[PDB]
Design a binder for these strands. Structure first.
Ligand code: K
Ligand code: K
Ligand code: K
Ligand code: K
Ligand code: K
Ligand code: K
Ligand code: K
Ligand code: K
Ligand code: K
Ligand code: K
Ligand code: K
Ligand code: K
Ligand code: K
Ligand code: K
Ligand code: K
Ligand code: K
Ligand code: K
Ligand code: K
Ligand code: K
Ligand code: K
Ligand code: K
Ligand code: MG
Ligand code: MG
Ligand code: MG
Ligand code: MG
Ligand code: MG
Ligand code: MG
Ligand code: MG
Ligand code: MG
Ligand code: MG
Ligand code: MG
Lengths: 126, 195, 123, 154
RNA sequence: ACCCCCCCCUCCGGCCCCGCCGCCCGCGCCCCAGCCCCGUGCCCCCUGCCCGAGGCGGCCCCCGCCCGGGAGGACCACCC
RNA sequence: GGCCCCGGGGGCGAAGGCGGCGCGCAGGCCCCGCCGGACCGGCCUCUGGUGCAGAUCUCGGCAGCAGUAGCGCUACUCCGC
RNA sequence: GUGGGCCCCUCCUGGUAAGCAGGACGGGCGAGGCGGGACGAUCCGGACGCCGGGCCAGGGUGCGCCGCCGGGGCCGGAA
RNA sequence: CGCCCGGCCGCUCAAAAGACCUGAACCCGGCCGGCGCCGGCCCGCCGGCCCCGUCUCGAAACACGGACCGAGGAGCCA
C-alpha cells in the first residue's frame, strides 16, 4: 500500500493553457488552439497576453504520469486483468473502470487486498 | 504614527511639494501651516502671467466639466501636491486623504510642534539676485478674498503666544532645576559613554 | 503576537516591490530602514530578521534582509510568503535581539524546489 | 409546473395559477409589493390599489412608468395601479389563506405573506399589418403565479 | 489703457447657528533675521518598543407623507 | 474484421446530462457525486460523407430596445341593468 | 510558395518642393518576442524552450516612477 | 377520497413518465453570497493587457463581415 521513494514532483505550470478570447464568447470553448491570424496579438506574443504552449513545459521523464500518492496507474475491469497486470509489480496501483457494478466490485476488491495492490476508488458504491 | 506639521514660511513650492508627496506615500500624516508665506522664484509679474495663462484653460462646451482653478494658497499647494501623487488609484487617494493644508495657523494645530525643511528653503536655494514672490500675493491678484482677515488673525495670535512664552521661560527654569534626580544622572553617564 | 511581544526593534517601512517601469517582481520587497542613508551603512542591518503584521488574523510574517538597493540605504528583503499589495506604506520591525523561528523566515522557493533532492520518503 | 418554494418543517398555505392572461411585469410588481405583509392588510391594501388610494411601486420594469405623489415613501418615485393584476392576486391570496386555515385552525391574525414567484408563460400569437405590404407580430406576455402564506419571518 | 482680475448680480455640493434633546477619539505651542550669521555648524531619532482620564483640539447622532387649493405646474416638484 | 484464460463491462444501473478532483506541453483522457433508464467498449489490422467563430452562411429558437412607438368618416347620456 | 513591396545609411536623376516620382552596395520591417526613444512596423541596444541566482548593453537617476553623489566652468527658424 | 370556493391534500404506478423518453445552450423569476484576462499574494491591492477574422508596404482604425445560442456547413471520387 506504499510505493518506493522517488524524486520530488515538479509541475512547471500549475494552471491550464486556455484558448485566446474564450472569455468573451460562449461559442468559443476553452480547449487549446494555435493562434493563426495575420494581426493576432497572441500570435505575436506581445507582453500581457496569455502564455503559449511549447515543449519546454514537459515534465521530467522519471515523474511524468505519477499520481500524487507516488503510484503509476492501471485501469482494469476484471479479476483476470487484475491478476495479470499486477503479477509482481511495485510501481502501479489499480483503478476500477466506472462501468463495473457493486456485485463485482466486491470480488475485485477482495482479490486486490489479497495480492497487496492499492486501489484508488475503493469506497465508491459503499 | 504621529503627525508631521510643517511651517511653510520660507519654503519653495515645488521642492516642499516633492518632499510632502514622498512622505505621504510612506503612510505618514502631514499638515502644512502658513501656506501664503511660501515662495515661488521669479518676478511676481512672471508668476502672475503664468497663473492667468493657467486660468484660461476650460472645457469649451461646459465649464462645470472643466479644470477647476482654486484661488487660495492652501488649495494651490494642494493642487501642486496632487500633481506629484497618482491620485486616481486607491493608493494615491489614501495618500491624499492623509494630507492637510492651511492658511495661517488655526487652533486645531496651534499646539503642534512645527518643523522645517532647510534644503528647500529659499534663503538656501536661490541666488541673491534672483527675484521671488510669496503665494498670498499672487492669490490676491487672481481672486482670493481673505488676505486682510488672515493678517488680523495672525497678529492677534502672535501677541497671545508672545505673552505665553514669558511664562514658558520660568516654567523651564523649574523644569531645568531637575539636575537632582540621580535616577536620571545614573543613566546620563551611560548616554555619555556612547556619545 | 504572543511570541514577539517583548522584543524591541528598529523601525522600517515597506514601500514597494522590486520593479522597472515595465515589469514588477513580487518575490522581493523594497524596504526603508530609519537612520540608514548610505549604501555602506546597510552592512549592519544586512542579514537581519524582520517581520510585518498582516492585519487579518493579526499575525506576523517573518523574513530576512538580503541585499542593498541604490546608493541611499534602501534594502531588499524576502519574506516567508510574498506580500499582498494592500500592506504597502505599513511598518516593518528590525529586531535588535535574536529569535529562533526555525524554518519560518525563509522564502517558499528555497523551502521547496531548493533541491536537496528531497526524496518523498513515505515513512 | 412545480413549486419554487421548497422549505421544509414549516406549516404553509399554498396557492397557484398557471397561464394567466395578464401582463407579466404588472403582475410581478403587484406580488412583490404585497410580499411580507400580514394578510389582513394585504387585502386592505389591494382594495385600496383598486380604489386608487395607494399605488404599486415599480422596481425592475419602469421605463415609461410615471412618477406620482403616492410613491413618496417607498424607495422610488415610480408606480402604477394594475387593476387586472390586483384581481388575479386577490383571488390567489384567498385560495392560499383558505388552504392554511382549513389545514390548521390558524387565524388570519398570525398569517403573513412569506414567498411569491412569477414566471413568463407561452403567449397568444396574433398578427398586425405594417406599411409597404409587411406583416409583424402582436403577441402577449402571460404569466405563471404562485403565492405562499405562513408564520412571521425571523 | 474699451483690455485683464475682484465687487454687485445667478446657480450653489458642503458647512455653521438655534429649537426637542446621548457617544466616541488624540496628548505636541516662542518669534524674527541670513552682506551679524550675536556666538551657531543642534535636536528628535520607542506609536508600544509599555504610552494611556481633567484643560485644549476633533468625531457620530438629531427632524413624514397622503389628502385639497394655488401666486406653482407635462408627470413630478414648489408655496399655502 | 479479430482478441479480451472456464470466456470482455451492463436494472447490484448502459449511453447521454450537471457539478467536482486527478493525469498530459497539448490535442484530450480518466475517476467521483447527483440526474437518467438500456446498451457500450480498450488493444491489433481495415474503411471514410471524419474535427468550425466567422462565408451580408442555412434552418430553428430567441434578448435588449420596452410596458416603448402606437390604438378620415361631428356623439353620446340616464334608468331597467 | 513567390513574380503589388517598403524603410534606413551612404551615392545619385527629374522637380520650387513634397510623408513626390525613378535608380545603386550593405542592412532592416515584411516574417523579429524583450528594454529604451512619453507616444510610432522600420530609430538606440539586444534578436526568443520552461525556471532559480549573478553580471550588466542602450537610456537614464527632484515627485509621478526603479535609480546618485563629488568637482571645474557658463547661465522649429533666416538675412 | 376528503376540504374550500379553480386551488389544496392525497390516489394509480417502479416512477408521473400526467400529454407525456432523456431534456443541453442562449435568455429569464424567487431565496442565499459578492461587486473582464494574465501574474504574485488568500483576496482586494499592486503590475502588465486596444477587436477578432481578412486583403494589404502598412489595421485599434473614421476599411469590410460579425446581437446571442444550438445543429448543419467546403480538396472526396473516376
Ligand atoms: K467560452
Ligand atoms: K499584419
Ligand atoms: K472675462
Ligand atoms: K456692475
Ligand atoms: K459514413
Ligand atoms: K422600441
Ligand atoms: K514643377
Ligand atoms: K524573419
Ligand atoms: K528578418
Ligand atoms: K478582405
Ligand atoms: K480587395
Ligand atoms: K497596398
Ligand atoms: K486587424
Ligand atoms: K491588416
Ligand atoms: K483611422
Ligand atoms: K476609430
Ligand atoms: K472605434
Ligand atoms: K484594408
Ligand atoms: K465604406
Ligand atoms: K470589399
Ligand atoms: K467592422
Ligand atoms: Mg397597420
Ligand atoms: Mg397590400
Ligand atoms: Mg463533411
Ligand atoms: Mg477561421
Ligand atoms: Mg511614397
Ligand atoms: Mg513603451
Ligand atoms: Mg524613486
Ligand atoms: Mg420530458
Ligand atoms: Mg454589420
Ligand atoms: Mg456544428
Amino acid at each position: 500500500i506504499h510505493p518506493l521513494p522517488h524524486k520530488i514532483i515538479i509541475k512547471k505550470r500549475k494552471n491550464k493553457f486556455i484558448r485566446f478570447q474564450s472569455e468573451r464568447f460562449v461559442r468559443v470553448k476553452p480547449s487549446w488552439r494555435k493562434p493563426r491570424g495575420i494581426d493576432s496579438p497572441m500570435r505575436h506574443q506581445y507582453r500581457g497576453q496569455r502564455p503559449m504552449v511549447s515543449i519546454g513545459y514537459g515534465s521530467d521523464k522519471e515523474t511524468r504520469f505519477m499520481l500524487p500518492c507516488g503510484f503509476f496507474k492501471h485501469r482494469i475491469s476484471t479479476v483476470h486483468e487484475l491478476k495479470t497486470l499486477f503479477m509482481n509489480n511495485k510501481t502501479h496501483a489499480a483503478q476500477i473502470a466506472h462501468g463495473v457494478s457493486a456485485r463485482s466490485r466486491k470480488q475485485i476488491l477482495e482479490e486486490a487486498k489479497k495480492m497487496g495492490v492499492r486501489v484508488l476508488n475503493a469506497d465508491a458504491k459503499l | 504614527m504621529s503627525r508631521i506639521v510643517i511651517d511653510c514660511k520660507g519654503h519653495i513650492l515645488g521642492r516642499l511639494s516633492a518632499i510632502v508627496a514622498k512622505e505621504l506615500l510612506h503612510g505618514h500624516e502631514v499638515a502644512l501651516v502658513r501656506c501664503e508665506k511660501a515662495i515661488i522664484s521669479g518676478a511676481f509679474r512672471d508668476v502672475k502671467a503664468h497663473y492667468l495663462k493657467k486660468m484660461h484653460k476650460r472645457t469649451n462646451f461646459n465649464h462645470l466639466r472643466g479644470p477647476f482653478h482654486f484661488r487660495a494658497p492652501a488649495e494651490i499647494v494642494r493642487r501642486t501636491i496632487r500633481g506629484m501623487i497618482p491620485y486616481k488609484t486607491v493608493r494615491g487617494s489614501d495618500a491624499m486623504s492623509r494630507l492637510r493644508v492651511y492658511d495661517g495657523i488655526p487652533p486645531c494645530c496651534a499646539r503642534y510642534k512645527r518643523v522645517v525643511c532647510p534644503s528647500a528653503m529659499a534663503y538656501l536655494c536661490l541666488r541673491p539676485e534672483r527675484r521671488r514672490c510669496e503665494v498670498g500675493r499672487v492669490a490676491h491678484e487672481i481672486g482670493w478674498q481673505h488676505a486682510a482677515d488672515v493678517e488680523r488673525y495672525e497678529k492677534r495670535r502672535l501677541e497671545e503666544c508672545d505673552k505665553w512664552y514669558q511664562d514658558k521661560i520660568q516654567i523651564d527654569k523649574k523644569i531645568a532645576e531637575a539636575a537632582e534626580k540621580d535616577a536620571e544622572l545614573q543613566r546620563i553617564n551611560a548616554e555619555l559613554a556612547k556619545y | 503576537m504572543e511570541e514577539i511581544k517583548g522584543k524591541t526593534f528598529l523601525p522600517a517601512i515597506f514601500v514597494g516591490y522590486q520593479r522597472s517601469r515595465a515589469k514588477q517582481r513580487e518575490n522581493v520587497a523594497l524596504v526603508k530602514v530609519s537612520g540608514i542613508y548610505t549604501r555602506a551603512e546597510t552592512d549592519k542591518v544586512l542579514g537581519r530578521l524582520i517581520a510585518i503584521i498582516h492585519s487579518k488574523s493579526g499575525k506576523p510574517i517573518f523574513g530576512k534582509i538580503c541585499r542593498p538597493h541604490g546608493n541611499s540605504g534602501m534594502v531588499r528583503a524576502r519574506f516567508y510568503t510574498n506580500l499582498p499589495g494592500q500592506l504597502m506604506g505599513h511598518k516593518v520591525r528590525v529586531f535588535y535581539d535574536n529569535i529562533d523561528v526555525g524554518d519560518r523566515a525563509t522564502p517558499k522557493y528555497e523551502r521547496l524546489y531548493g533541491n536537496p533532492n528531497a526524496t518523498v520518503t513515505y515513512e | 409546473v412545480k413549486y419554487a418554494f421548497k422549505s421544509d418543517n414549516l406549516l404553509v398555505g399554498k396557492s397557484r395559477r398557471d397561464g394567466v392572461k395578464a401582463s407579466f411585469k404588472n403582475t410581478y410588481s403587484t406580488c412583490r409589493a404585497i410580499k411580507g405583509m400580514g394578510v389582513k392588510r394585504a387585502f386592505a391594501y389591494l382594495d385600496n390599489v383598486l380604489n386608487h388610494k395607494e399605488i404599486v411601486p415599480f422596481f425592475k420594469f419602469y421605463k415609461g412608468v410615471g412618477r406620482h405623489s403616492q410613491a413618496r415613501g417607498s424607495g422610488t418615485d415610480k408606480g402604477r395601479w394594475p387593476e387586472k393584476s390586483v384581481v388575479v392576486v386577490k383571488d390567489i391570496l384567498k385560495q392560499a389563506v383558505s388552504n392554511a386555515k382549513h389545514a390548521h385552525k390558524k387565524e388570519e391574525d398570525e398569517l403573513y405573506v412569506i414567498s411569491y414567484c412569477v414566471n413568463r408563460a407561452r403567449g397568444r400569437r396574433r398578427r398586425t399589418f405594417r406599411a409597404h405590404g409587411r406583416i409583424s407580430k402582436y403577441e402577449s406576455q402571460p404569466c405563471h403565479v404562485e403565492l405562499i402564506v405562513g408564520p412571521k419571518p425571523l
